[PDB]
Amino acid sequence: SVKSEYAEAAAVGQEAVAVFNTMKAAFQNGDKEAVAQYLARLASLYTRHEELLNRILEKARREGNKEAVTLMNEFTATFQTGKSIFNAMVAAFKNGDDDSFESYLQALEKVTAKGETLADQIAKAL
Numbered sequence: 001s002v003k004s005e006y007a008e009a010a011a012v013g014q015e016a017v018a019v020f021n022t023m024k025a026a027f028q029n030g031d032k033e034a035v036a037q038y039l040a041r042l043a044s045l046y047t048r049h050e051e052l053l054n055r056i057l058e059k060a061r062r063e064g065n066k067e068a069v070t071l072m073n074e075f076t077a078t079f080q081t082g083k084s085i086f087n088a089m090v091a092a093f094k095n096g097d098d099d100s101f102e103s104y105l106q107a108l109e110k111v112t113a114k115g116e117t118l119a120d121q122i123a124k125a126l
Protein backbone atom coordinates (compact mmCIF):
# COMPACT_ATOMS: atom_id res chain seq x y z
CA SER A 1 0.00 0.00 0.00
CA VAL A 2 0.96 3.65 -0.19
CA LYS A 3 1.15 3.54 3.61
CA SER A 4 3.73 0.73 3.63
CA GLU A 5 5.56 2.54 0.84
CA TYR A 6 5.69 5.61 3.10
CA ALA A 7 7.05 3.50 5.98
CA GLU A 8 9.78 2.27 3.63
CA ALA A 9 10.53 5.86 2.65
CA ALA A 10 10.56 6.86 6.30
CA ALA A 11 13.18 4.20 7.09
CA VAL A 12 15.38 5.45 4.24
CA GLY A 13 15.05 8.94 5.71
CA GLN A 14 16.14 7.62 9.12
CA GLU A 15 19.17 5.98 7.50
CA ALA A 16 20.22 9.39 6.19
CA VAL A 17 19.77 10.84 9.67
CA ALA A 18 22.08 8.15 11.01
CA VAL A 19 24.73 8.64 8.33
CA PHE A 20 24.39 12.42 8.74
CA ASN A 21 25.14 12.42 12.47
CA THR A 22 28.11 10.12 11.91
CA MET A 23 29.39 12.42 9.16
CA LYS A 24 29.05 15.41 11.51
CA ALA A 25 31.23 13.65 14.09
CA ALA A 26 33.79 12.89 11.37
CA PHE A 27 33.81 16.52 10.17
CA GLN A 28 34.35 17.82 13.69
CA ASN A 29 37.26 15.36 14.13
CA GLY A 30 38.79 16.43 10.81
CA ASP A 31 38.58 12.94 9.23
CA LYS A 32 37.95 14.30 5.75
CA GLU A 33 38.38 10.90 4.10
CA ALA A 34 35.45 9.63 6.12
CA VAL A 35 33.41 12.74 5.42
CA ALA A 36 33.87 12.34 1.67
CA GLN A 37 32.57 8.77 1.78
CA TYR A 38 29.63 9.66 4.04
CA LEU A 39 28.69 12.54 1.72
CA ALA A 40 28.57 10.13 -1.22
CA ARG A 41 26.45 7.75 0.86
CA LEU A 42 24.08 10.56 1.86
CA ALA A 43 23.72 11.70 -1.76
CA SER A 44 22.56 8.28 -2.90
CA LEU A 45 20.23 8.07 0.11
CA TYR A 46 18.61 11.42 -0.66
CA THR A 47 18.23 10.45 -4.32
CA ARG A 48 16.40 7.30 -3.20
CA HIS A 49 14.26 9.09 -0.59
CA GLU A 50 13.31 11.81 -3.10
CA GLU A 51 12.21 9.17 -5.62
CA LEU A 52 10.11 7.29 -3.06
CA LEU A 53 8.44 10.52 -1.98
CA ASN A 54 7.57 11.42 -5.55
CA ARG A 55 6.03 8.03 -6.15
CA ILE A 56 4.01 8.38 -2.96
CA LEU A 57 2.75 11.83 -3.94
CA GLU A 58 1.85 10.65 -7.44
CA LYS A 59 -0.08 7.72 -5.96
CA ALA A 60 -1.94 9.91 -3.46
CA ARG A 61 -2.91 12.11 -6.44
CA ARG A 62 -4.16 9.13 -8.44
CA GLU A 63 -6.15 8.00 -5.37
CA GLY A 64 -7.77 11.41 -4.98
CA ASN A 65 -6.48 11.68 -1.40
CA LYS A 66 -6.66 15.46 -1.25
CA GLU A 67 -5.36 15.88 2.28
CA ALA A 68 -2.41 13.57 1.69
CA VAL A 69 -1.63 15.40 -1.55
CA THR A 70 -1.65 18.79 0.24
CA LEU A 71 0.66 17.53 2.96
CA MET A 72 2.99 15.78 0.51
CA ASN A 73 3.19 18.93 -1.67
CA GLU A 74 4.20 20.86 1.47
CA PHE A 75 6.67 18.19 2.55
CA THR A 76 8.32 17.68 -0.84
CA ALA A 77 8.85 21.44 -1.12
CA THR A 78 10.67 21.42 2.21
CA PHE A 79 12.63 18.36 1.08
CA GLN A 80 14.04 20.46 -1.78
CA THR A 81 14.99 23.08 0.82
CA GLY A 82 16.96 20.40 2.63
CA LYS A 83 18.45 19.12 -0.63
CA SER A 84 19.72 22.51 -1.83
CA ILE A 85 21.34 23.04 1.57
CA PHE A 86 22.96 19.59 1.36
CA ASN A 87 24.35 20.30 -2.09
CA ALA A 88 25.85 23.65 -1.02
CA MET A 89 27.37 21.78 1.92
CA VAL A 90 28.96 19.30 -0.51
CA ALA A 91 30.36 22.21 -2.51
CA ALA A 92 31.74 23.81 0.66
CA PHE A 93 33.52 20.54 1.38
CA LYS A 94 35.01 20.34 -2.12
CA ASN A 95 36.20 23.96 -1.73
CA GLY A 96 37.72 23.44 1.73
CA ASP A 97 35.40 26.08 3.21
CA ASP A 98 34.81 24.74 6.70
CA ASP A 99 33.00 27.90 7.81
CA SER A 100 30.37 27.41 5.14
CA PHE A 101 30.23 23.67 5.81
CA GLU A 102 29.39 24.35 9.47
CA SER A 103 26.70 26.89 8.53
CA TYR A 104 25.08 24.53 6.05
CA LEU A 105 25.31 21.62 8.50
CA GLN A 106 23.35 23.40 11.25
CA ALA A 107 20.79 24.74 8.77
CA LEU A 108 20.16 21.29 7.31
CA GLU A 109 19.58 20.08 10.88
CA LYS A 110 17.01 22.81 11.60
CA VAL A 111 15.22 22.33 8.27
CA THR A 112 15.03 18.61 9.03
CA ALA A 113 13.78 19.00 12.59
CA LYS A 114 11.13 21.52 11.48
CA GLY A 115 9.81 19.13 8.84
CA GLU A 116 9.17 16.28 11.26
CA THR A 117 5.69 17.17 12.50
CA LEU A 118 4.63 17.21 8.84
CA ALA A 119 6.29 13.83 8.24
CA ASP A 120 4.24 12.28 11.04
CA GLN A 121 1.05 13.91 9.72
CA ILE A 122 1.59 12.28 6.33
CA ALA A 123 1.92 8.80 7.82
CA LYS A 124 -1.53 9.26 9.34
CA ALA A 125 -3.12 10.74 6.23
CA LEU A 126 -2.21 8.14 3.61
Ligand SMILES: Nc1cccc(Oc2ccccn2)c1
Pocket residue numbers: 013046050078079080081082083084086108111112115
Ligand atom coordinates in the same frame (compact mmCIF):
# COMPACT_ATOMS: atom_id res chain seq x y z
N1 LIG B 1 17.45 16.16 -0.45
C1 LIG B 1 17.72 16.42 0.89
C2 LIG B 1 19.03 16.28 1.28
C3 LIG B 1 19.38 16.52 2.58
C4 LIG B 1 18.46 16.89 3.52
C5 LIG B 1 17.15 17.04 3.15
O1 LIG B 1 16.26 17.43 4.10
C6 LIG B 1 15.04 16.94 4.35
C7 LIG B 1 14.85 15.54 4.43
C8 LIG B 1 13.59 15.08 4.72
C9 LIG B 1 12.55 15.99 4.93
C10 LIG B 1 12.86 17.34 4.84
N2 LIG B 1 14.06 17.84 4.56
C11 LIG B 1 16.74 16.80 1.84
